[PDB]
Amino acid sequence: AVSFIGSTENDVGPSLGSYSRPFVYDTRNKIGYQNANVWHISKGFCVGLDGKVDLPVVGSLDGQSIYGLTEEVGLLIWMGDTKYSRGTAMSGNSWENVFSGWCVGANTASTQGLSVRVTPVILKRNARYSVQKTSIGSIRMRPYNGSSAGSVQTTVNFSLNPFTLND
Ligand SMILES: CO[C@@H]1O[C@H](CO)[C@H](O)[C@H](O[C@@H]2O[C@H](CO)[C@@H](O)[C@H](O)[C@H]2NC(C)=O)[C@H]1O
């Protein structure tokens, strides 16, 4: 089986968080969302994840997209499985495989989770830059091996909480 146990709408990062020192801010996992338990799965269900970023691509760094928020501020974005180190660097605006997948035991149960992580980028200087709450994109479960979603909700959404960068 599969069922949806997570939340449809999800905020990334603490609201009105402040961060200090294209220039990339070292924010680690602070501007993140993580949930180990988004779908409940059982009895041989096989599932991975696709991610999609809806923000405009305004540049590229080391093979991943810089996504634009404002004239001064962009984002590097990762989506993936639960643990932050599993994140896949996002490029472009299409669905992208961000977790190859796994299969829960034929006789047992577990969950499928996810993580979204971003790091702010100064694209252009004015030295205090604020960003408002902004839709980022979505992640969808991707069944495989003949597993079926039925009509279970496949997709969850992410919004960037507002933040301020101090330079
Ligand atoms: C037998 O326990 C299960 O072990 C597998 C690895 O064999 C896996 O770690 C399972 O945990 C889930 O793993 C998912 C895919 O990595 C992940 O998306 C979920 O968050 C994990 N669910 C948890 C940690 O409760 C584990 O149940």
Side-chain angles (χ1 to χ4, degrees), residues 1-20 22-25 27 29 31-42 44-85 87-123 125 127-167:
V2 59
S3 55
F4 177 61
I5 58 173
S7 177
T8 301
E9 300 298 324
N10 301 283
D11 301 327
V12 178
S15 198
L16 287 136
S18 288
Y19 308 88
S20 291
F23 180 84
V24 179
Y25 276 61
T27 58
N29 300 328
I31 316 180
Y33 174 92
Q34 185 182 58
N35 190 341
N37 309 118
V38 178
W39 295 271
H40 183 265
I41 61 173
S42 66
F45 199 89
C46 296
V47 68
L49 300 173
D50 307 316
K52 183 164 70 84
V53 177
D54 296 336
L55 297 170
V57 171
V58 296
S60 71
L61 188 59
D62 294 302
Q64 85 187 277
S65 289
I66 300 172
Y67 292 102
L69 292 173
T70 71
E71 193 195 341
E72 296 94 341
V73 183
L75 287 176
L76 307 174
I77 302 187
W78 293 260
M79 291 173 157
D81 200 28
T82 308
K83 309 274 198 223
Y84 281 117
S85 68
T88 304
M90 297 301 292
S91 291
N93 293 121
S94 299
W95 288 107
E96 163 181 341
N97 190 341
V98 300
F99 173 43
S100 297
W102 73 297
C103 304
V104 65
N107 306 303
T108 62
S110 191
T111 59
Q112 174 61 44
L114 54 73
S115 70
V116 176
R117 187 180 75 88
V118 308
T119 60
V121 185
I122 303 303
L123 303 177
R125 283 188 172 94
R128 180 144 189 292
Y129 313 95
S130 292
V131 165
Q132 308 310 131
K133 186 154 186 53
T134 298
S135 175
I136 295 164
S138 301
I139 284 177
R140 99 238 275 208
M141 62 149 170
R142 175 189 73 255
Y144 67 95
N145 195 54
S147 293
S148 179
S151 63
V152 171
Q153 177 179 330
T154 64
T155 303
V156 303
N157 305 316
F158 302 94
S159 297
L160 183 66
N161 262 340
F163 69 64
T164 299
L165 305 176
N166 295 108
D167 199 10

